[PDB]
Amino acid sequence: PFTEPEWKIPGYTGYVQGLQETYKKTPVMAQLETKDPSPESFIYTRTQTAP
Amino acid sequence: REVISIHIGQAGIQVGNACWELYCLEHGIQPDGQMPDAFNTFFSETGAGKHVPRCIFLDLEPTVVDEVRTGTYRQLFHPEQLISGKEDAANNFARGHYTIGKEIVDLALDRIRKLADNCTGLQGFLVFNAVGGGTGSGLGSLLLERLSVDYGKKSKLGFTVYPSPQVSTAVVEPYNSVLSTHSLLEHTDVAVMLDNEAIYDICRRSLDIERPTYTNLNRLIAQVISSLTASLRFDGALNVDITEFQTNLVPYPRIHFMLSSYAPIISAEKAYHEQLSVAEITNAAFEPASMMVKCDPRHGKYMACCLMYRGDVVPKDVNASVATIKTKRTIQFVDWCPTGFKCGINYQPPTVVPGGDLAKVQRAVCMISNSTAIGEIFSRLDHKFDLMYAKRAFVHWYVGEGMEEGEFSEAREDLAALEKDFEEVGA
Amino acid sequence: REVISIHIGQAGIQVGNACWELYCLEHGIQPDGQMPDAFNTFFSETGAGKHVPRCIFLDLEPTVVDEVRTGTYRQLFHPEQLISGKEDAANNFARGHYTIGKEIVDLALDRIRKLADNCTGLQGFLVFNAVGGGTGSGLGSLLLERLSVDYGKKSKLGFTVYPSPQVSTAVVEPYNSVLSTHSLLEHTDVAVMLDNEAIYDICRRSLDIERPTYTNLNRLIAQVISSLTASLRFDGALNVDITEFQTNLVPYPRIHFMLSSYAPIISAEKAYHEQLSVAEITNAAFEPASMMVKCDPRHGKYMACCLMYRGDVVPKDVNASVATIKTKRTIQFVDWCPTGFKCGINYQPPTVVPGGDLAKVQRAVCMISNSTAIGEIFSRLDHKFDLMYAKRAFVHWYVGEGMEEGEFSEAREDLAALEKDFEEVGA
Amino acid sequence: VEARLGKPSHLLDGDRLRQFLENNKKVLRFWCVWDERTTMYGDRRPYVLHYYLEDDSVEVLEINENNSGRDPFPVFLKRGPLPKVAVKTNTTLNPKFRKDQCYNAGDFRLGLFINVLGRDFYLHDADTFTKQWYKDNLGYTDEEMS
Amino acid sequence: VEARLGKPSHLLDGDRLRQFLENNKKVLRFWCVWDERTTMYGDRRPYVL
Amino acid sequence: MREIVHIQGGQCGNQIGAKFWEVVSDEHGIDPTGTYHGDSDLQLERINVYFNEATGGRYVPRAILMDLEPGTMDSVRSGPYGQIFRPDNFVFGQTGAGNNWAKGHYTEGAELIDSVLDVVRKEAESCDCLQGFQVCHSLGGGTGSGMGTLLISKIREEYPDRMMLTFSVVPSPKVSDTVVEPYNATLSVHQLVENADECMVLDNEALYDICFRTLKLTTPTFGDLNHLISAVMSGITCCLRFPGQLNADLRKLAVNLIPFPRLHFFMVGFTPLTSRGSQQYRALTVPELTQQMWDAKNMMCAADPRHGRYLTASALFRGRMSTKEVDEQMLNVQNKNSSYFVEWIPNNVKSSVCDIPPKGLKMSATFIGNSTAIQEMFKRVSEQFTAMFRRKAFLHWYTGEGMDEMEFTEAESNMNDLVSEYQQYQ
Amino acid sequence: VTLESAMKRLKQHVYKQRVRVKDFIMDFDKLNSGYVFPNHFLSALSMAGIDKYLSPKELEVICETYKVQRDATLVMVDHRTFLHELELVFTVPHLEKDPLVEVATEPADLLDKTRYLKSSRVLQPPEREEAVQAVICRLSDVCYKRGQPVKAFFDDAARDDHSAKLFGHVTLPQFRQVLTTKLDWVVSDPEVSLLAAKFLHEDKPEFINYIAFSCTVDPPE
């Protein structure tokens, strides 16, 4: 399970860096999308792609 | 026999942070939800092995609630038993009771409704709110009103935090106190008074922590709650249910206002020097310096008292201990009640939070008592209401929100009747 | 049969520091409070493997109490017993009895109360104080007043330390003595006299100590305490309790001032050679060079005598020993008293202190007598009190506190009344 | 005499708080099986057993299976010290059982039979904390705790 | 203490006028280029100094 | 618990007081940085009497420097242990009284005292149990006495329930530094005898005789004299900072020394004072400390004590000593020198033992004698005053400041009857 | 208690209090022949006031190691050899016979001078020292991120009269309370035991040095 302090509750109005670039994904998986992104995600290409 | 508790406001859901901290360790529940019969009253087991609390946290300000959502008790509470609005009530009762109250409370009670669902033997409700706040007064006195039309017959145990006599936190307290008290009377069967000065007293006198904070207060509130509910959870020689307070403590439908007292409040180092006996921990609960509400129980007369016990307590000396209590003239009962004691004995010794200011003790006593000195509290707070009223001070915050002038006059006239009662009944 | 012991002032609680150092050894109690049924009269068995004394050290300055809090007996006591003010009485009777005592005695006796009820067979009190000072005499008297009105019939044994004729550490002490005895004359029951100067002589002659500090004086005072009270902790062949002193030694309701002595004051080396026996330690108790009070008893006549024995003493010979004393004509009894002894025999020998100065003797005698010589002490104090008073010297401090000349002119005549009652009873 | 003059009863007995302080929440849990099939109805059945190191008391909790024929009852034996022996009962005074008469933590040996009020429970397991405690304090080998 | 009682501020710290006199209008100009293309918008860009 | 606030006025006081803090700092083991670097734990139980913990082991003295020239305020921070004082406490004017009592007490005090009372009020309320005040000043200078005097009277109304110690050096015709000394002292003394509770008389004349006869110093600068006075001030308050067998706090002393309200002028002393030559040769027990104590040449006042009688006398011993050996000494002196002690006050000597001797010493002492020989120090001054004031010499600097001719006639009047009632009790 | 333990403990006490012991010893032998009686040897230490600080077991060990049979049936203690060590603490006597030897300004073995500044004690198990440094590292990080002062909170439990007080020290339960209640961060029992064992006092093993603990969990600079 995802029980670390880094993950957050679904009812979390607190801010998470980069949740305005996600869609069609549950919140906990959305917090996974920002930290360890998949090659198809925009959060991956804004960070680890060569210019 | 299950019981559900609703925590409303800034204060209410901070004590609930300290209440639910005790329950999970007293029953050996790890802070994530499982263990490495008696919890049936508080934690409803679900699925494989994971226990979840029977309690809701609603507050219109999203600041404190999501702290819990990211505190140490994350996996314990469920995702949806934590309700949070978008903005607060800001010490304005009317603002909490009508504008925002209407938009969230039907979401609230339609969550409690599926809390009674899984429950089977719901004993009652017990609330926590600060009558001096914006949500404690508003969203409580709105929900308390709406619960009593759904269930009605069930008892309601209020643990409300009153504004201290001279110590205070906000400026418009005496307005939100009377507007809620007007609605506390006709719905709450048994309301247990709590102060903030009187508890700042105890942390300094007994636990001698000179500069205490809230987390010291909330912890020993979480004791009294667990002490008066222990009869349902564990087995005792002489146990008292949560309906006894609805029959052993309320003589009149409107005289429902109780003082609380807990003993022995002793730190770790003064513990083993002191001789812990039933003679004095029954005595300690009666000195005026050992109450949770700043008032002198000497001025009035006790209507009815109920003494809960814990741990290794033989039923013999509890009799000879209270037998002396009647023979002290420094305290006086009302002649309209020649017998007014309700002793309840239980077997579980008081569990101490790890790293708390309290010591492991073999026994403990909580005293919930009705009296007439409380009739002084509603007076001394009443006095300061009229002063701000003749000047119409802070009023336009109320009428500007939607409410009007009438309930300012009549809630003053409602509590006006309450003074005559504690005067007349004390005669 | 328990007894509580309070200590007041610099001299009082310093002596008590040597008494409890002694008791913990007489019962094998380590300083931290746990043994590895005689203790019952001094220590309440609290908790499990713990014992807390029946004692309260109190004063106005912190320096001498907080020294115990950091001493080696930190864990022995109960940190609630050790009371301490903030500003000293400064050898100013009026300051500790009218200014500073007015705030601290309420906290004092309200602690003595919850030590009394914790007892079961309370015999009486025994208090320690030096009447030369301001707090030991000033509030020591004020404290004794409120004990008498509260208990009345509990025997109060005041072990005072009077100022010496020649050696003295204060200049206003003759004032503080006369003022103190104005109350102690009528409140206490059995007031024992002790000088610092007479005890200085004992250490030089018999203990061959040429430089004795207070640490020694307070040490061999505890022996006198630990002897007359051992008739309770160890059942002797001929018991004598605290009340016996009250009726055997007080021939008139005002003459309660007992000369004390003790034997043998022997060193560890001379303990080998001296053939210790009963017929000589009885003589050693009456030689005027062995009483702790600076006075020549041969100048008066014994009102009545009392003789505590300890160790290996059979009562055949104490009859013989007392017989020879009454045959000797150098010491003479008053004609009002043909039968003049209160014999007393115990079983447990004296206890030695590792690092102490007294040896392990097989037996010992503690004589507490009553003479007509003790008038000379009050005849002496009254003179040097009258000298300074004729100039009104140092008066403007006592008056300047808030007292008046009244308390001086009327206490001066009380000692006049007392001395007149000694030359009368001596007829 | 002290009792009649007013004195705390726990102080009268003594040596109570010391054990409670050191072992406040220490409970040895065992899994017993009670074979009874040899009687003229019913079957064999598992139970658990709590040994409270604080008070040396025993508490036998009955575990329940889904759709068992048994009415749900949380507890099977009250929390009182086991007698371990037959004592000539007196009709007036319920027997006072001394620690020597009662069971001790050293008696459970993981393969023995426990005469619990005539019932002979065969205990057959233990929790990790109990195994660790036995190795720590009673010098048991790893193999015994199997 | 001098600042309270009234004293020229520039004289309090001191050693100011000396440099200003010797180097009054002496300015070292450099052409820097700030590469930033590695961020998620925009490019590199020249500046002066 | 018990606290002392320390005020230093004028050049004479600030320099003495500077040594007083370098001394007391070392008795508790804190370096000039203000951090603890001692060894015994007993150094830190009672540092609140003299210090406040600032942040992370920094201790600041509870002192208030004050004068009317920024000259001393620079020098006081020059030397070591100058970096410990709180800069906020450095209240000081700018002009300079110029050895004029009237200017310090009427002109500059008018505009600066309201500011020093501020910081005094702050330090006093910041603590819990004020034991008293400790003023280090002089009696001949202008801003020492006149400015320091008004500060006193402004206080006795504010804290009328506290002690007040003022170590004030006096002028002597052999050390005649200024010219208007008789005008300043007599003007100052008239106010101490009303407001101050008790003052310790000092003078530079006797402090030199000590530094030649017994110390055998060749060239004793002001650094050694002020170092001697610092010891006595550091000894009087030993019963507050350290546990002792027979404790005697400040008030326990006063009530034992002052028989009548107007007689509170003490002479002082200190033992052992030994040259570093005869240090290795002499015996250090209790009788030595006493014969060197009652030695008329050891008093730090130019008043021969065998020319008068001791009303009372006190002696604070420090170190592990035998209280018998201490006391029977004081008895012997009172029996042998039977004439020099008052008849109508029996047992004129109070003793006190403290368990922590000064830094480096195994044993010390301190003498405080309320004699009647201190009358001459006022007699030699009362005549210098009346010798000048007869021709009104130097007067126009006071009359042209706010004083009238009445006050000088009144000050000498009060000073006169004061000397009268020392001779009275003798 | 062994001899070296008792010896350095007595040395520490006599040096820190600057107590003159020779006075109480000389009067017990009028003849200056040394060899004072054992009772008088213990008596003089009681006079000096050392009884409060050291244990009677420790005074007993000191007597038995300096005891010497002047005769087959007579035993005494040569106080001269003992007084020799007691001034070897302060200085080095008879320096005139040897100028080349250098003496230190103070005995370094007896004194800490930094017990309120640093934790001198070391844990003998390396993994135990590893864990204690790991926990303080985590704690210093949390304190620096939150901006909490540490020593300010311990002043409360120390200053009060109702606790057994010792400067720079709070006992274990009050330490734990200030650790979790007054400060935010949460610490478990094994790490509390490590935090106690490092800053524990060796004189009195139940006092915890909060001053040193604060100084190492955040430096003042």
Ligand SMILES: Nc1nc2c(ncn2[C@@H]2O[C@H](COP(=O)(O)OP(=O)(O)OP(=O)(O)O)[C@@H](O)[C@H]2O)c(=O)[nH]1
């Ligand atoms: N005893 C105790 N009182 C608390 C605690 N938290 C808040 N309070 C009390 O709450 C009062 C202020 O009202 P709040 O409850 O904070 O305000 P509110 O009810 O949430 O209403 P809004 O602030 O408008 O959202 C103060 O007077 C406190 O005494 C707590 O943790 N313990």
Ligand SMILES: Nc1nc2c(ncn2[C@@H]2O[C@H](COP(=O)(O)OP(=O)(O)OP(=O)(O)O)[C@@H](O)[C@H]2O)c(=O)[nH]1
């Ligand atoms: N026997 C004995 N007498 C002592 C001791 N300490 C002080 N005294 C005597 O006590 C007398 C004065 O009384 P103290 O107790 O010291 O002073 P006080 O009563 O506490 O009054 P304050 O000093 O104002 O606190 C002195 O003259 C001493 O003779 C001691 O340790 N043993």
Ligand SMILES: Nc1nc2c(ncn2[C@@H]2O[C@H](COP(=O)(O)OP(=O)(O)O)[C@@H](O)[C@H]2O)c(=O)[nH]1
């Ligand atoms: N003991 C001592 N006396 C000093 C010192 N400096 C000055 N004096 C004396 O102070 C006297 C004058 O006092 P002064 O400082 O002028 O007072 P002020 O001008 O009002 O501050 C002179 O007679 C000096 O003897 C010093 O360092 N030590």
Ligand SMILES: [Mg+2]
């Ligand atoms: Mg709120």
Ligand SMILES: [Mg+2]
């Ligand atoms: Mg005293």
